[PDB]
Ligand binder design. Structure first.
Ligand SMILES: *[C@@H]1O[C@H](CO)[C@@H](O)[C@H](O)[C@H]1NC(C)=O
Ligand SMILES: *[C@@H]1O[C@H](CO)[C@@H](O)[C@H](O)[C@H]1NC(C)=O
Ligand SMILES: *[C@@H]1O[C@H](CO)[C@@H](O)[C@H](O)[C@H]1NC(C)=O
Ligand SMILES: *[C@@H]1O[C@H](CO)[C@@H](O)[C@H](O)[C@H]1NC(C)=O
Ligand SMILES: *[C@@H]1O[C@H](CO)[C@@H](O)[C@H](O)[C@H]1NC(C)=O
Ligand SMILES: *[C@@H]1O[C@H](CO)[C@@H](O)[C@H](O)[C@H]1NC(C)=O
Ligand SMILES: *[C@@H]1O[C@H](CO)[C@@H](O)[C@H](O)[C@H]1NC(C)=O
Ligand SMILES: *[C@@H]1O[C@H](CO)[C@@H](O)[C@H](O)[C@H]1NC(C)=O
Ligand SMILES: *[C@@H]1O[C@H](CO)[C@@H](O)[C@H](O)[C@H]1NC(C)=O
Lengths: 109, 373, 205, 119
């Protein structure tokens, strides 16, 4: 089962700035990544899938890139409601690679 | 019985007093350091290179069908390629796919635009999946698609690729039908190709480099697999570990599975010959299957362990003779300050003296040890 | 017409290498000074049907290479699967497909397995043991046109394809716009003298 | 649509618990995977297992819970997962999320249920 190593554990950015989160795997996943945002008291909400695709109802500020073993998530024009914990997770359902999440990354406005 | 050589001598002699002389106590033996397996190279490597980098793929409704069996399928070439962006594959991990061994492999190769690349998946519903190519629910295959906008799409739109957009029913899993019966609807008066509620089920979409990424064509290949219900014919590669010389190592050359030390041999081999044997039907030289050269093998060093000691009443100091071995591999005794070498073996704990006296404790090859000032 | 095979018909029994060792092997060989059968192909003259009976030693001396292939099968008349070897200038072809051939098939001037790879005398042994079909070959030059000369020459393995089809009958091909010898193998213990380089220089029955 | 969970709450240490996720508005077709994830009270998400929908019986377990979980599809609308030999470290919040066969991210997450391993 592949493991997700997500850094930095804690980040602080001002209003309107950009915050970048790094996710690294133990083996090559060939995209199949999903970026999530979880607010306290709320189940996680999907933001980015396939490491490059944005779902419906998702602002263009969130943007994911990367390939192979290294992936990046950037959030531009940070807002007061963006304070949450962001997660990276492989989407291998029946591939024996698992779907383990990485270390949660909280953001401070 | 294991504290020191004098105690070993006492245990072997079954007495608490040991008389002056040399007593064989135990047997030296050099354990193998590691295991190396230098298996040969590829027997029958039929690759997917021509399947993937083909000149042109087939139409999606009548896809390119290939059967892979009785081969050694190298999945590592597919694994190392990063051009694939939709490795949406099930049943087997990409890294363990080489290890996995299956009876048959089916290659379904065609061209699909980025809009319905999602539809190439088990349990997915859509016009393209239900009209051109459908995946089984019990899907153990491996779906790999990559961008081909720079290759397939041409200026003014490409029309050599045809797809079915109209059909009364849905395609059963892995069904191909090139008959392309005319679509009928409504009162169905369309005897020919065009009529009321009548259209050609086959159509072509212009592919352009400046078109949207969703409309850009991608080259897609499905590697359908199947379980081990029979002896396998297509399988993965084997091990190619390195070779180590001048070290006692268990070795495996073409199934030889012999243990010894390896050296470069001056003896010559005929091209067909793969290994040599002694006059006693024991292997003594092996030709390396990976690289054509000869390796002399000799058995791991072994021999008796003797303790040379005066009377236990005189002194408790002892020397250790490892018979027929060079001192370099002897440690593999505590008194390593003086370690002398003779034809009899390696003697540890005694110092050589130029002067010659009458023999007291014979060792071998004209050498004797004695207890003196 | 017969002849006697003085010393020919010995091959390396296995891929094992030995130096200056007299090694005794019990294996299927051609007996020394054994009477083997002669065939003519010039002038008419045709090639007859032969049995297999546990291996075949075939030695053909040729000037323009009239010999062009071998057929190995119990029936090989499209009745059952049969091994076919065809030697062309381009390549050597090995099939198991069934073919129907007449009594005297001449060459102008499902398949289970497939393989692609008088100064001149070509020596061969074809054997079937443990489901394995083995070929041994040599091409030593002969200056005697009457008969195979006195002397010795070891035979080296070339193909070990596992055909798995039992063979009890064998035929050879000729070319039409040339004599050749056929021996027979049986279990006969041999003592082979290995040279310092590993070449079999002499052997005793 | 919607996903709901039932069968959580207080569980004695060393016992076994059974959790069920019931869907509303769709069915567990072969194009969707039913996956289970857990969340410690102050830590991140830890994946548990998944099971393919439809007639397929294919199932993937995590490394940590390979021998302590049992995930199987009881019905086209309900799924069940069982924990064995519960410890205090297993106190977490279980989320029932679906995953498309296209290997996209999980959408339509359930509200979740809290399980507490204490006496
Ligand atoms: C493959 O094995 C052959 C055996 O003859 C060897 O010569 C060659 O170096 C090996 N490797 C490659 C990459 O061909
Ligand atoms: C052929 O396809 C393979 C797919 O793995 C790719 O890695 C390779 O680069 C291709 N060859 C060329 C010459 O582009
Ligand atoms: C050892 O020497 C002492 C004194 O020389 C003597 O008393 C004793 O008997 C000797 N022991 C043996 C085993 O010969
Ligand atoms: C060990 O001793 C042998 C025998 O004298 C000698 O030939 C050889 O060079 C020595 N080996 C090493 C590795 O020193
Ligand atoms: C014995 O003689 C050698 C010369 O051969 C000399 O160098 C050496 O000191 C002597 N050996 C020892 C162990 O002292
Ligand atoms: C060759 O030997 C066989 C077997 O003994 C015998 O029948 C035959 O007549 C011999 N041929 C000649 C030409 O002597
Ligand atoms: C090949 O030969 C025969 C020809 O009649 C065919 O019927 C048979 O099925 C085939 N045999 C095998 C073992 O494939
Ligand atoms: C040998 O041929 C017989 C027919 O006489 C056949 O039944 C048998 O299977 C064959 N054996 C092998 C090993 O091909
Ligand atoms: C053995 O050595 C070489 C190896 O190539 C060979 O040419 C030579 O003729 C052989 N010697 C004898 C005496 O057969």
């Amino acid at each position: 089962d592949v493991v997700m190593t997500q850094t930095p554990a804690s980040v602080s950015e001002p209003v309107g700035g950009t915050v970048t989160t790094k996710c690294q795997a133990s083996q090559n996943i060939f995209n199949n990544l999903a970026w999530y945002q979880q607010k306290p008291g709320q189940p996680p909400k999907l933001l980015i899938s396939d490491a490059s695709n944005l779902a419906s109802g998702v602002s263009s500020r969130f943007t994911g890139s990367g390939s192979g073993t290294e992936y990046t998530l950037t959030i531009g024009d940070l807002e007061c409601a963006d304070g949450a914990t962001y997660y990276c997770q492989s989407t291998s359902y029946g591939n024996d690679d698992g779907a383990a999440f990485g270390g949660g990354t909280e953001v401070v406005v | 019985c294991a504290l020191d050589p004098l105690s070993e001598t006492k245990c072997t002699l079954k007495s608490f007093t040991v008389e002056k002389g040399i007593y064989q106590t135990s047997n030296f033996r050099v354990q193998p350091t590691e295991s190396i397996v230098r298996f040969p190279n590829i027997t029958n490597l039929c690759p997917f290179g021509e399947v993937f980098n083909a000149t042109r793929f087939a139409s999606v409704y009548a896809w390119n069908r290939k059967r892979i069996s009785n081969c050694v399928a190298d999945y590592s070439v597919l694994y190392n390629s990063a051009s694939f962006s939709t490795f949406k594959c099930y049943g087997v991990s990409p890294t363990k796919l080489n290890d996995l061994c299956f009876t048959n492999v089916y290659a379904d190769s065609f061209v699909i635009r980025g809009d319905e690349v999602r539809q190439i998946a088990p349990g997915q519903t859509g016009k393209i999946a239900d009209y051109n190519y459908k995946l089984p629910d019990d899907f153990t295959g491996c779906v790999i698609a990559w961008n081909s906008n720079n290759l397939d799409s041409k200026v003014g739109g490409n029309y050599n690729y045809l797809y079915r957009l109209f059909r009364k029913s849905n395609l059963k899993p892995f069904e191909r039908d090139i008959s392309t019966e005319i679509y009928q609807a409504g009162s169905t008066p369309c005897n020919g190709v065009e009529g009321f509620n009548c259209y050609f089920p086959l159509q072509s979409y212009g592919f352009q480099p400046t078109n949207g990424v969703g409309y850009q064509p991608y080259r897609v290949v499905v590697l359908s697999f199947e379980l081990l219900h029979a002896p396998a014919t297509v399988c993965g590669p084997k091990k190619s570990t390195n070779l180590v010389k001048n070290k006692c190592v268990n070795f495996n050359f073409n199934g030889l599975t012999g243990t010894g030390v390896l050296t470069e041999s001056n003896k010559k081999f005929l091209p067909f010959q793969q290994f040599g044997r002694d006059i006693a039907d024991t292997t003594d030289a092996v030709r390396d299957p990976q690289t054509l050269e000869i390796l002399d093998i000799t058995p791991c060093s072994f021999g008796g362990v003797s303790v040379i000691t005066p009377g236990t009443n005189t002194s408790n100091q002892v020397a250790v003779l490892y018979q027929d071995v060079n001192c370099t591999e002897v440690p593999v005794y505590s008194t390593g300050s003086n370690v002398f070498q003779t034809r009899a073996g390696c003697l540890i704990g005694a110092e050589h003296v130029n002067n010659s006296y009458e023999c007291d404790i014979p060792i071998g090859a004209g050498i004797c040890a004695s207890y003196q000032t | 017409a017969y002849t006697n095979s003085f010393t020919r018909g010995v091959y390396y029994p296995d891929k094992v290498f030995r130096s200056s060792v007299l090694h005794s092997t019990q294996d299927l060989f051609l007996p020394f000074f054994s009477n083997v059968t002669w065939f003519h192909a010039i002038h008419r003259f045709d090639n007859p049907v032969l049995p297999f009976n546990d291996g075949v030693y075939f030695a053909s001396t040729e000037k323009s290479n009239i010999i062009r292939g071998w057929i190995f099968g119990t029936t090989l008349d499209s009745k059952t699967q049969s091994l076919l070897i065809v030697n062309n200038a381009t390549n050597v072809v090995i099939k198991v497909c069934e073919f129907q051939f007449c009594n005297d098939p001449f060459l102008g001037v499902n398949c289970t397995f497939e393989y692609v790879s008088f100064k001149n005398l070509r020596e061969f042994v074809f054997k079937n043991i443990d489901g394995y079909f083995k070929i041994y070959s040599k091409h030593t030059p002969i200056n005697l046109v009457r008969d195979l000369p006195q002397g010795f020459s070891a035979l080296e393995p070339l193909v070990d394809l596992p055909i798995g089809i039992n063979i009890t009958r064998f035929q050879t091909l000729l070319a039409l716009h040339a004599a050749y010898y056929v021996g027979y193998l049986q279990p006969r213990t041999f003592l082979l003298k290995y040279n310092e380089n590993g070449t079999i220089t002499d052997a005793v029955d | 649509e919607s996903l709901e969970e039932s069968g959580g709450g207080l569980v004695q240490p060393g016992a076994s618990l059974t959790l069920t996720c019931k869907a509303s508005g769709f069915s567990f077709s072969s194009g969707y995977y039913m996956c289970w994830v857990r969340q410690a009270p102050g830590k991140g998400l830890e994946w548990i297992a998944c099971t393919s929908g439809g007639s397929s019986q294919y199932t993937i377990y995590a490394n940590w819970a390979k021998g302590r979980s049992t995930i199987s599809k009881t019905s086209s609308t309900t799924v069940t997962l069982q924990m064995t030999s519960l410890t205090a470290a297993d106190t977490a919040t279980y989320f029932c999320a679906r995953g498309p066969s296209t290997y996209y991210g999980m959408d339509l997450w359930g509200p979740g249920t809290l399980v507490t391993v204490s006496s």
